Amino acid sequence: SMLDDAKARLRKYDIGGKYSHLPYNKYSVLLPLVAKEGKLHLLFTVRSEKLRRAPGEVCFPGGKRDPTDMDDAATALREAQEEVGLRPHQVEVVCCLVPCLIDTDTLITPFVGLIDHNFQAQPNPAEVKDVFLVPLAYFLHPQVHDQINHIFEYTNPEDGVTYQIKGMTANLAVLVAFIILEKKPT
Numbered sequence: 001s002m003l004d005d006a007k008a009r010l011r012k013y014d015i016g017g018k019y020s021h022l023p024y025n026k027y028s029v030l031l032p033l034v035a036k037e038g039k040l041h042l043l044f045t046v047r048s049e050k051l052r053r054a055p056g057e058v059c060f061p062g063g064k065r066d067p068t069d070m071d072d073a074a075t076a077l078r079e080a081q082e083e084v085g086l087r088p089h090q091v092e093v094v095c096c097l098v099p100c101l102i103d104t105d106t107l108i109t110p111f112v113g114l115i116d117h118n119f120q121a122q123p124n125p126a127e128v129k130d131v132f133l134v135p136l137a138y139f140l141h142p143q144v145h146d147q148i149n150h151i152f153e154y155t156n157p158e159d160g161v162t163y164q165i166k167g168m169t170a171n172l173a174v175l176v177a178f179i180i181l182e183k184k185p186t
């Protein structure tokens with residue numbers, strides 16, 4: 001099946017807890033996969049305009065590890081619940097992808113999660129201005145704009161709204177698309 005195939009692909013890139021004990025400032029993100037209309041999608045947030053870092057930017061749910069978290073996956077799930085109302089029973093964490101090093105002292109660990117079909121996002125307006133889906137296949141043939149660095153523009157055909165996706169967020173989206181969609185019979 002589509003979902004069994006995606007999970008099998010993802011597990012081959014799982015680094016697990018290999019880098020998780022290193023003494024960094026630690027953040028986790030959840031890369032949430034949603035199946036709609038016979039295709040996989042990624043769920044993105046738009047950060048509230050009131051936030052300190054990167055107001056109004058597109059990102060994945062996530063945030064800083066706190067002492068309550070049993071592990072890095074727990075960070076991702078706790079923050080996702082706070083931001084968009086995703087409950088633990090509504091997500092299956094499939095793997096941990098390559099972590100991202102920033103600012104010399106920070107390590108961001110991305111987890112891919114399969115999202116239940118009855119989840120409906122409830123954006124928390126103190127943290128998130130918007131939540132939207134992009135088909136995973138978009139990231140194989142994106143609309144690129146050079147700002148000089150590469151930015152993706154995605155237009156939602158439901159309403160004509162355009163979102164800009166860039167940086168770590170754009171890079172992780174491409175990675176997930178390659179992992180799941182490369183070398184597939186039609």
Ligand SMILES: COc1cccc(CC(=O)Nc2ccon2)c1
Nearest residue numbers: 045047059060061062063127169
């Ligand atoms: C891939 O994008 C990133 C990069 C860095 C940190 C985060 C976590 C985060 O702050 N997500 C939020 C907050 C409010 O809405 N989403 C995500």
